[PDB]
Write a protein that binds this ligand. Structure first.
Ligand SMILES: NC(=O)C1=CN([C@@H]2O[C@H](COP(=O)(O)OP(=O)(O)OC[C@H]3O[C@@H](n4cnc5c(N)ncnc54)[C@H](OP(=O)(O)O)[C@@H]3O)[C@@H](O)[C@H]2O)C=CC1
Ligand SMILES: [Zn+2]
Lengths: 86, 460, 96, 297, 208, 125, 115
C-alpha cells in the first residue's frame, strides 16, 4: 500500500502537455517540499499522451493519462495518489 | 564517442573512431583507442561458487542461479541491496531495479556520488551537461570547478581547446593548476572562491556578467567529496546570479555538470540512488555487485556472512570477495544502451559474442528472476527497451539531446539545506597523465595501458 | 631451437603446445606431431652483421629478381644496427 | 570446465558439445547408434577397435573432420585401455558377446574387461562411466551369461562407485539380433518378453550422459508393451508375410523378462518408449518377397 | 588513341542508332527507351505488356528478322520497386546484327511467356523461375530445372545467402540422406575490397 | 483486369526463409561510416542493410572460425533510405534505421594562419 | 488505387477455391505416396503433415501470394506423383534427425546466446 515513487512523463512542445508544464513550473517545488523523501521523476515523452506513473510496494505500478488536463486536474490527481483515495 | 570496432574471425582487432560532429568529431582518446587489449585478459567465463574450503570453483549456470535465488527468496526488503559499476548498460540497470523492486528493495545504488538534497535526480537538468558538447563552440566564457577535463573527458577538453583557439574563448578554473593544453585563469583552489564569486566580490563575477554566453562546468569528482551538496549549491548560486543579472539570453542553459563514468546518467534517469550511503546506513544481508569494482563497500562494511553476488566480465577487486560469480558481457559483446554526460542515449552493437559461458546481463537478471518465481514481464531485448521507455522514455531516443530546462526549480530547492564548505583544496583524482590510463577494470587488465604508465613514469 | 613442453610434446616455432588438461592431445596418440626442426629466428640470428662504409645501403635479399623488393636502410644510428624488414639481414657502419 | 570443453554452436555437426567420449564396443549393434548420436551433436568420439578397420569404416561419416579417432586395443592389456581413455571425460562400455570363443568366454567379456575398464577410467580421472548390463541379470541365474553380467555389474560398481548402470531388455532394431533371430527360423505360451527399441536405448545413454544427477543410479530400459513369446513370434511372422545360440540363447529366450518397478527407466530420462508395432515393419520389410499382437500389462 | 586502347567503330554506332530510332518509331506503344553503348550494342527498353508484340516484330519483320534467341535471363536489383529486369538477347543472321530487349517485373507480377515466339525460351523461362521466382504465364510446363526437388527459395536473388539454409548428409540411424541447417566449419570470409577515391569521373552521379 | 487490393506487401511465405531467421533477426539500415584511416568518401554514398551478428566459435580442428547462421555475410546496397525500408518491410524483417551523417561545411582560411592578434596564428609550418 | 495485374485469382473467393482443390488433390494422393515410397509413416500422419503445411500459410491476405503458393504446392504435388522425388525428399518434411529446440527462455539461456 505504501507509495514508492511517482513518475511524470510530459512532452516538451505538445499542447496536450501544457497543463502538466504549467503544474510543474508553478508548484513542483512546493510539492517537493511537501514530500522531501519521495522521488518524483520528471521525464519527457515524444508524440505520446502525457502520463503519470505510481510505483507501490513489491513492484506494483499503475498509470493514469494526464492528456489535456489543466494544472488543477493533475494536481488533484497527485493528491489522490498521495493520500491513497480513488 | 562513436567508434568502429574491427573484428576478424570472432576476435576484436582494433578500435577506430567514427565521425560524429556533435560528440567527438573525428577523434577518440588514447584509452578509448588502446584499452581493448584488456578485453582478452582476466575474463570471467564460467559461473563460480564457494566450495567447502571457501574457495571459488566452477559450477553450472543452473546451480549458481538456484543458489542466488534461494538467498533472494530468504530475505526481502531492506536486507537486499545492489551496487552498479561504471560500465553497466540501461538494460541491466532496469532489469536489476525491477528484480529488487519485486523484493520490495529500494536500496539500488551506484558507486558514483551525486548530491540528493533538493531536487536530486528528480529533475534531469540537475545532473546533465545542459550546454552540450557542441554548445561549447558558442560560449564566450567558461568556468571549470573541481575538475580536470583533459583526463576526465578528453574530447570535451578538445572541444574546449578548439573553441579557445578559434572563438577566442575565455577559460577560468577553480582547483589545482593542472595542464589543460591551453592557457586559462587560475582563480584559486579553495572552495570559498565559489562563495566569493556568488556574493559578487570577485572580479570574475563581473567578467561572467559581461559574458553573452556564460558557461559554468562542475565535475562529478568535486561532488565525490563530502562537500558535494554545498559545492553544487554554490555553483547553482553563481548560475542563478548570472541569470538574474545578465537576463534571459534564451535557451542557453548556463548550468552544467561533467560526468566521468558511462553508466551514471542512465542509472540516475532510472531512479538509482547516487552514492553508496544507503548501504552504509542500512547494511544488507544480500548484496548485488553489478560490475562494481570501485571498492566502496568491502566485507568490513557488511554484516557477518553477508551474501555477495558479483556479475561482470572481468576478474578485479569486486570478484574475490563474492560468494557467487555470474559471468557477464562486455560493451563489445552486447547491443546495449548508454547515455552520455549530455543526456544523449546511444546504443552499441554486437561485434563478438561473450566468451565461454558468459551471457547478456539483462538475460542473466531475467533468468534469475524466473528461477526465484519473480518472473519479469520482458523476454526479448525489444521488451526490455519497452520497459526502459516505460520508466524513462528518453532512453529510446537514440540521438536526441534536446531537453527541458528546470534550473529555477532545482536552484530554489537547493536553498533548503545549508551545509558548510570545508577548507580542503579541490584536487582532481587524475592529476597527471599517469593517472589517466588505469581507471576501470578493462583499463586495469590492459597491457598497453600498463606500458603507457611505465613509459610516463620513467622515460627512455 | 626446438624445446619440449613439460607434458612431453615438442614446442613449435610459434610457441604453441597443448596444455596438460587439453583433450586435443588425443589426436597425437598412436601418431606423431609435425614440428619443423629449423627455427628461422635462430638461423637469422646466426648470420654475421655486414660491415659497409656507406651511410645508406640497399638490400634485395640476394639473387636479384629472385629475392625481395629492394629497400634502402639508413645506418646513421650507432646504438643499434640496420635490419632489413624483408630478409632480416643486419648492416652496420665501421665504428671506430 | 576446461574452456576447450565449453559447449559452442547450435548442437550440430560442426558444433562443440563438451563431450569427449570413449565408446568401447562401438563396432557392434548399439555402438553405431551411440556413435551416431554422439557425433551428430559435435562431440569428440574415441572409437577403440580390436577388429579390422574395414569393419569400422561405416563409423567414419558419423562426425565432422577430426571428431572420430580410431585406436587399436585389446581387453587383456591395461596399457591400451589407458591410452584410449586418457583424455576422455565420458567412458561408455558396450563390450559384449552372446557366445563364448576359444579365447574369450563369458567371464572375460562380462567381468574382467568391464572391471579393468572401470579401474583404468577411475585411475585416469574420467568424470563419468556408463556400463551396460542385462535386465534379467542376477547371481543365481541358470545361464552363465546373466551370472557374468551380474558379477561384472557388481565389480564395476566396486571399481567406479559413480558409474551409471543401464539394463536394457531384448533390444530390437535393423541390425538387432532379436527381431532377426526370430524371423530367420523359416516354444511359447509360458514366457513373457518386453523388448525395447534401439534408438530409445541410444537416446537414453545420451541423456544419462547429459543428466548431472544420474551418476550412481541404475536404470532399466524396457519397452511400453509386454508380450507373450508365442504371440510375439506370431506377430513377427504376420508382419513378414510368412507361414507360421547353442544352449545359452535358447535358455535366455525361454525365460521371462523381469519387472523392476523401483529401478528408474526411460521415462525418468525424458524419453517416451516406442511400441514395437511402429518399428516392426521397418525391421522386417526385408524379410518379405496390421493386427497388432495382444499385450499383458 | 594508342595500341592499348580498344578502337571505336562509328559506322556500326550510327547504324544501330538509326535502327533503334526505326524500331522505336514503329512501336511507340511499348518502347520506353533506346540506347547504344560505346562498344556498339543496341538496347531497347519496353513496357512489360509489349514482350510478345516487340519480340514478334523483331523476329518476323523483313527489315529486322531476328530469327535466333541467343539468351534470356534476369537481373536482380533490390533497390528498385520492380525488383527484376528481364533481358532478351537476339541474333539476326540476315543482317549479322544483335539486339537486346529489356523489361521489368516484381515478385508478384507475371510476365507473358515468349515460347510462341521462340521455342528456345522454354528452358530459359524455367531457369528464370527457378533462380528468381519470376512466374511466366501460359508456359507449357513451368517447374524447377536446376535446384533439387523440394528446394525452398530462389538462390539467385541478392538476399539469398551464398551457402543456403540447409545442407545434406547421410544418417545411419534412418539409413537415408537427410537435410539439416547449414553449419560451416569455417565461415566464408567477407572481404571489403571497394576502395574510396572514385575511379571513373564520367559516371559520377549528382549529389542530390 | 486489375484487382485494386489494399494491403501491405508481404512475401515472407514465398522467399523460403526459415521461420527463425525472419522474426528473430534485426537488420540495420545505415550509410557506412568513412574509414578514418583514409580521406576518400566514395564508400559513404549508398545505403547498406546488414544483419545482427551471431555466435562465432573456434573449430576444434584447425581453430577456424565456425558459424551457424546463413545471414552473417549478407549485405545489401540501396540508393535511398526509403528503398531499404520498403525492402526490409516486404521481407518481414525488423529493422533499425540510422540517419545519414554528413560532415558539416567548415570555414577554411589560409590567411588566418598568419594572424596579427588571434590565437589561430601558427607557430610553425 | 493499388491496382495490380492478376495471376490467376481476381479476389479471395476463387483463390480459396484453388486452395481447396489443391488440398483435395494432396489428401487423395497421400495414401498412394505412402504405399509407393514404402514410407514408415502412417496415412494419418501424412495427412496431418499436409494439413500442417497448408496451415503454416493461413495468415496470407493477398490473393496473388495465395495463388503463387497454390502454384508452388501444385509443383510439389507434381514432383511427388511422378516419382521425381526419392524417399529422402518426402521424408525431409518430418525432420526426424533434428534434435528439438526448446522454446522457453531458460533453455535458450542455458544452451547459448541465440534468442
Ligand atoms: N539384445 C541386445 O542386443 C542387448 C545387448 N545387451 C548388452 O548390451 C551391449 C551391447 O550389445 P550389442 O551391441 O547388441 O552386441 P554386439 O555383438 O553387436 O557388439 C559387441 C561389441 O563389443 C565388442 N566386443 C565384443 N567382444 C569383445 C572382446 N572380447 N574384446 C573387445 N571387444 C569386444 C565388439 O567388437 P568386435 O566387432 O571386434 O567383435 C563389438 O564392438 C553389450 O554389452 C550386450 O551384452 C543388453 C541387453 C540386450
Ligand atoms: Zn633483405
Amino acid at each position: 500500500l505504501g507509495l514508492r515513487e511517482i513518475r511524470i512523463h510530459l512532452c516538451q512542445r505538445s499542447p496536450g502537455s501544457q497543463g502538466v508544464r504549467d503544474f510543474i513550473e508553478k508548484r513542483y517545488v512546493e510539492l517537493k517540499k511537501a514530500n522531501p523523501d519521495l522521488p518524483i521523476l520528471i521525464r519527457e515523452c515524444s508524440d505520446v499522451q502525457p502520463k503519470l506513473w505510481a510505483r507501490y510496494a513489491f513492484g506494483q505500478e499503475k498509470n493514469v493519462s494526464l492528456n489535456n488536463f489543466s494544472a488543477d486536474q493533475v494536481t488533484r490527481t497527485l493528491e489522490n495518489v498521495l493520500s491513497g483515495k480513488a | 564517442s562513436n567508434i568502429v570496432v574491427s573484428t576478424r574471425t570472432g576476435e576484436v582487432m582494433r578500435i577506430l573512431p567514427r565521425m560524429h560532429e556533435d560528440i567527438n568529431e573525428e577523434w577518440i582518446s588514447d584509452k578509448t583507442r588502446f584499452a581493448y587489449d584488456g578485453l582478452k585478459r582476466q575474463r570471467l567465463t564460467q559461473p563460480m561458487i564457494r566450495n567447502e574450503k571457501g574457495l571459488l570453483t566452477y559450477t553450472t549456470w543452473e546451480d549458481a542461479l538456484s543458489r542466488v535465488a534461494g538467498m533472494l527468496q530468504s530475505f526481502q526488503g531492506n536486507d537486499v541491496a545492489a551496487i552498479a559499476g561504471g560500465l553497466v548498460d540501461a538494460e541491466a540497470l532496469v532489469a536489476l531495479k525491477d528484480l529488487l523492486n519485486r523484493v520490495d528493495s529500494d536500496s539500488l545504488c551506484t558507486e558514483e556520488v551525486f548530491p540528493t538534497a533538493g531536487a536530486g535526480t528528480d529533475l534531469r537538468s540537475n545532473y546533465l551537461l545542459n550546454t552540450t558538447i557542441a554548445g561549447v563552440e558558442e560560449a564566450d566564457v567558461i568556468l571549470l570547478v573541481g575538475t580536470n577535463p583533459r583526463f576526465e573527458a578528453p574530447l570535451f577538453n578538445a572541444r574546449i581547446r578548439k573553441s579557445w583557439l578559434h572563438n577566442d574563448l575565455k577559460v577560468a578554473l577553480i582547483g589545482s593548476p593542472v595542464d589543460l593544453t591551453y592557457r586559462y585563469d587560475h582563480l584559486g583552489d579553495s572552495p570559498k572562491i565559489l562563495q566569493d564569486i556568488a556574493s559578487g566580490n570577485h572580479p570574475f563575477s563581473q567578467i561572467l556578467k559581461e559574458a553573452k554566453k556564460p558557461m559554468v562546468v562542475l565535475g562529478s569528482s568535486a561532488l565525490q567529496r563530502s562537500d558535494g551538496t554545498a559545492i553544487l549549491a554554490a555553483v547553482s548560486n553563481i548560475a542563478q546570479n548570472i541569470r538574474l543579472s545578465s537576463g534571459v539570453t534564451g535557451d542557453w542553459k548556463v548550468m552544467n555538470i561533467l560526468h566521468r563514468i558511462a553508466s551514471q546518467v542512465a542509472a540516475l534517469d532510472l531512479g538509482y540512488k547516487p552514492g553508496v550511503e544507503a548501504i552504509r546506513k542500512n547494511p544488507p544481508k544480500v548484496l548485488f555487485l553489478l560490475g562494481a569494482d570501485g571498492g566502496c563497500i568491502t566485507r568490513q562494511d557488511l554484516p557477518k556472512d553477508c551474501f555477495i553476488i558479483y556479475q561482470g566480465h572481468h576478474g578485479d577487486v569486486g570478484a574475490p570477495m563474492a560468494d557467487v560469480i555470474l559471468p557477464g558481457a562486455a560493451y563489445t559483446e552486447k547491443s546495449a544502451t548508454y547515455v552520455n554526460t549530455e543526456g544523449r542515449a546511444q546504443q552499441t552493437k554486437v561485434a563478438v559474442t561473450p566468451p565461454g559461458l558468459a551471457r547478456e546481463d539483462w538475460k542473466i537478471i531475467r533468468a534469475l528472476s524466473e528461477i526465484a518465481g519473480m518472473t519479469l514481464p520482458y523476454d526479448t531485448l525489444d521488451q526490455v527497451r519497452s520497459r526502459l521507455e516505460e520508466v524513462s522514455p528518453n532512453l529510446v531516443r537514440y540521438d536526441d539531446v534536446e531537453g527541458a530546462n528546470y534550473f529555477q526549480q532545482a536552484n530554489e530547492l537547493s536553498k533548503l539545506v545549508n551545509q558548510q564548505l570545508l577548507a580542503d583544496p579541490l584536487v582532481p583524482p587524475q592529476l597527471t597523465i599517469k593517472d589517466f590510463y588505469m581507471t576501470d577494470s578493462i583499463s586495469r587488465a590492459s597491457q598497453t595501458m600498463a606500458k603507457c604508465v611505465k613509459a610516463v613514469t620513467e622515460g627512455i | 631451437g626446438v624445446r619440449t613442453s613439460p607434458t612431453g610434446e615438442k614446442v613449435t616455432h610459434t610457441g604453441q603446445a597443448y596444455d596438460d588438461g587439453d583433450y586435443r592431445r588425443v589426436r597425437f596418440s598412436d601418431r606423431q606431431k609435425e614440428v619443423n626442426e629449423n627455427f628461422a629466428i635462430d638461423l637469422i640470428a646466426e648470420q654475421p652483421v655486414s660491415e659497409v662504409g656507406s651511410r645508406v645501403i640497399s638490400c634485395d635479399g640476394g639473387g636479384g629478381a629472385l629475392g625481395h623488393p629492394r629497400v634502402y636502410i639508413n645506418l646513421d644510428k650507432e646504438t643499434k644496427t640496420g635490419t632489413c624488414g624483408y630478409c632480416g639481414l643486419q648492416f652496420r657502419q665501421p665504428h671506430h | 570446465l576446461h574452456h576447450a570443453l565449453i559447449p559452442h554452436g547450435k548442437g550440430g555437426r560442426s558444433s562443440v558439445s563438451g563431450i569427449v567420449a570413449t565408446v568401447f564396443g562401438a563396432t557392434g549393434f548399439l555402438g553405431r547408434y551411440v556413435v551416431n548420436h554422439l557425433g551428430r551433436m559435435g562431440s569428440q568420439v574415441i572409437v577403440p577397435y580390436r577388429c579390422e578397420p574395414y569393419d569400422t569404416m561405416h563409423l567414419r561419416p558419423m562426425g565432422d573432420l577430426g571428431q572420430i579417432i580410431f585406436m587399436e586395443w585389446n581387453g587383456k592389456d591395461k596399457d591400451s585401455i589407458r591410452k584410449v581413455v586418457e583424455h576422455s571425460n565420458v567412458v561408455i562400455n558396450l563390450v559384449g558377446r552372446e557366445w563364448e570363443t576359444k579365447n574369450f568366454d563369458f567371464e572375460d567379456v562380462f567381468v574382467k574387461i568391464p572391471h579393468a575398464i572401470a579401474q583404468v577410467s577411475k585411475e585416469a580421472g574420467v568424470e563419468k562411466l556408463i556400463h551396460i548390463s542385462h535386465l534379467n541379470a542376477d547371481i543365481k541365474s541358470p545361464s552363465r551369461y546373466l551370472r557374468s553380467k551380474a558379477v561384472g555389474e557388481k565389480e564395476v560398481r566396486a571399481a567406479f562407485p559413480e558409474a551409471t548402470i543401464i539394463k536394457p531388455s531384448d533390444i530390437f532394431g535393423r541390425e538387432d539380433r532379436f527381431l532377426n533371430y526370430f524371423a530367420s527360423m523359416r516354444l511359447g505360451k509360458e514366457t513373457v518378453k518386453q523388448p525395447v527399441y534401439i534408438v530409445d536405448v541410444s537416446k537414453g545413454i545420451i541423456n544419462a550422459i547429459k543428466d548431472p544427477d544420474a551418476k550412481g543410479k541404475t536404470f532399466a530400459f524396457v519397452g511400453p508393451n509386454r508380450y507373450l513369446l508365442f504371440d510375439l513370434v506370431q506377430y513377427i511372422f504376420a508382419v513378414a508375410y510368412r507361414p507360421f545360440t547353442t544352449r545359452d540363447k535358447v535358455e535366455r529366450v525361454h525365460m521371462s523378462d523381469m519387472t523392476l518397478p523401483h529401478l528408474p527407466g526411460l521415462e525418468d530420462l525424458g524419453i517416451q518408449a516406442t511400441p514395437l508395432e511402429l518399428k516392426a515393419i521397418e525391421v522386417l520389410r526385408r524379410h518379405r518377397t496390421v493386427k497388432p499382437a495382444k499385450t499383458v500389462n | 588513341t594508342r595500341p592499348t586502347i580498344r578502337p571505336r567503330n562509328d559506322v556500326v554506332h550510327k547504324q544501330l542508332s538509326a535502327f533503334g530510332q526505326y524500331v522505336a518509331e514503329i512501336l511507340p506503344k511499348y518502347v520506353q527507351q533506346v540506347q547504344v553503348s560505346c562498344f556498339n550494342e543496341l538496347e531497347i527498353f519496353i513496357h512489360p505488356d509489349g514482350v510478345i508484340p516487340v519480340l514478334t516484330f523483331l523476329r518476323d519483320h523483313t527489315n529486322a528478322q531476328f530469327k535466333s534467341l541467343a539468351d534470356l535471363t534476369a537481373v536482380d536489383v533490390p533497390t528498385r520497386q520492380n525488383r527484376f529486369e528481364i533481358v532478351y538477347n537476339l541474333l539476326s543472321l540476315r543482317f549479322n546484327s544483335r539486339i537486346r530487349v529489356k523489361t521489368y517485373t516484381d515478385e508478384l507480377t507475371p510476365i507473358e511467356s515468349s515460347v510462341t515466339v521462340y521455342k528456345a525460351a522454354n528452358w530459359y523461362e524455367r531457369e528464370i523461375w527457378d533462380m528468381f521466382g519470376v512466374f511466366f504465364a501460359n508456359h507449357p510446363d513451368l517447374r524447377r530445372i536446376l535446384t533439387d526437388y523440394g528446394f525452398e527459395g530462389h538462390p539467385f536473388r541478392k538476399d539469398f545467402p551464398l551457402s543456403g539454409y540447409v545442407e545434406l548428409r547421410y544418417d545411419d540411424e534412418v539409413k537415408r540422406v537427410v537435410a539439416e541447417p547449414v553449419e560451416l566449419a569455417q565461415e566464408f570470409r567477407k572481404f571489403d575490397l571497394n576502395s574510396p577515391w572514385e575511379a571513373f569521373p564520367a559516371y559520377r552521379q549528382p549529389p542530390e | 483486369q486489375l484487382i485494386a487490393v489494399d494491403e501491405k506487401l508481404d512475401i515472407t511465405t514465398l522467399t523460403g526463409v526459415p521461420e527463425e531467421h525472419i522474426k528473430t533477426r534485426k537488420v540495420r539500415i545505415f550509410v557506412p561510416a568513412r574509414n578514418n584511416m583514409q580521406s576518400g568518401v566514395n564508400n559513404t554514398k549508398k545505403w547498406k542493410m546488414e544483419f545482427d551478428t551471431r555466435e562465432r566459435w573456434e573449430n576444434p580442428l584447425m581453430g577456424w572460425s565456425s558459424t551457424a547462421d546463413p545471414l552473417s555475410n549478407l549485405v545489401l546496397t540501396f540508393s535511398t533510405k526509403e528503398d531499404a525500408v520498403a525492402f526490409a518491410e516486404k521481407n518481414g524483417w525488423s529493422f533499425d534505421v540510422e540517419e545519414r551523417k554528413v560532415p558539416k561545411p567548415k570555414s577554411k582560411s589560409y590567411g588566418a594562419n598568419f594572424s596579427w592578434n588571434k590565437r589561430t596564428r601558427v607557430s610553425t609550418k | 488505387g493499388t491496382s495490380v495485374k492478376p495471376i490467376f485469382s481476381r479476389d479471395m473467393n476463387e483463390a480459396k477455391r484453388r486452395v481447396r482443390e489443391l488440398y483435395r488433390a494432396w489428401y487423395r494422393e497421400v495414401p498412394n505416396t505412402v504405399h509407393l515410397f514404402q514410407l514408415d509413416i502412417s496415412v494419418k500422419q501424412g495427412r496431418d503433415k499436409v494439413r500442417e503445411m497448408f496451415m503454416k500459410n493461413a495468415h496470407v491476405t493477398d490473393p496473388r501470394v495465395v495463388d503463387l503458393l497454390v502454384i508452388k504446392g501444385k509443383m510439389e504435388l507434381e514432383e511427388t506423383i511422378n516419382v521425381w522425388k526419392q524417399r529422402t525428399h518426402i521424408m525431409r518434411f518430418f525432420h526426424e534427425t533434428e534434435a528439438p529446440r526448446p522454446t522457453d527462455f531458460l533453455s535458450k539461456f542455458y544452451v547459448g546466446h541465440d534468442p
